[PDB]
Structure 1
Amino acid sequence: SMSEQSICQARAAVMVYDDANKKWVPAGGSTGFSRVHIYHHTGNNTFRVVGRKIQDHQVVINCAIPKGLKYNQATQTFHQWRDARQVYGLNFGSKEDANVFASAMMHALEVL
């Protein structure tokens, strides 16, 4: 709370790609929608994506946004990115949610 501020909140089903099985799987193990933030650590000017399931508050994503990230807006309601360890996808609950999140992501990627 002291070092980070939320710069957006968006509704999405958070998924990760199981490359061994070539299938998307629910992040955290159970399907359903989460409230997904981008948090800005204002002191170090770093950003991370944190999402929590609406129903039971489980943290299902907590990943750094590195400078230079390629954010792929595959469709108007499904966006995705990768790191060295995982491929992440957000199935947004609406186009408005996708726009809110992408706008904050693109902002983070510009100021990083």
Structure 2
Amino acid sequence: GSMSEQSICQARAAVMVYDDANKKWVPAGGSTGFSRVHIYHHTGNNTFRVVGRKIQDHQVVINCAIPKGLKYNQATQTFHQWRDARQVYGLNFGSKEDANVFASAMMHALEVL
């Protein structure tokens, strides 16, 4: 938390999860809109996670570990995505600057893990 984790970036993005059964992206957490998406570094054990909160109502729409070896796909300059055993996640960034901020922090996490 506040004492164990440190934010290494903030970026604006609509967070989406892939509905594998329907072959469609769905808003993470149930409602379409932009979130503030952090990567948080647990400095103690050198782990990272992605945490995003809807700007409007503060709902946490994503909270997922970044595992070592993750393949992070920059599909376009403003839409990046990744997978784990359970979900495919997509970040539709509000600008290329946000995309670069977040990708730059994710790529750091992946090299230091």
Q: TM-score, normalised by structure 2?
A: 0.99
Counterparts of 1:2 and 1:108, CA distance in 2: 19
Give the deviation of 1:78 after TM superposition. Answer: 0.0
Structure 1 residue ranges (4+ consecutive) displaced by more than 3 angstroms after TM superposition:
none
Counterparts of 1:2 and 1:100, CA distance in 2: 24
Deviations 1:9-60 (A, max 9, x none): 0000000000000000000000000000000000000000000000000000
Give the root-mean-square deviation of aligned CA atoms.
Answer: 0.1
Name the % identity. Answer: 100
Deviations 1:46-101 (A, max 9, x none): 00000000000000000000000000000000000000000000000000000000
Task: Report the secondary structure of 1:80's partner residue.
Answer: strand
Number of aligned positions between the proteins? 112
Counterparts of 1:5 and 1:39, CA distance in 2: 5
Counterparts of 1:101 and 1:2, CA distance in 2: 22
- Extract unaligned runs of 5+ from structure 1: none
Counterparts of 1:60 and 1:5, CA distance in 2: 19
Counterparts of 1:23 and 1:35, CA distance in 2: 23
- Extract unaligned runs of 5+ from structure 2: none
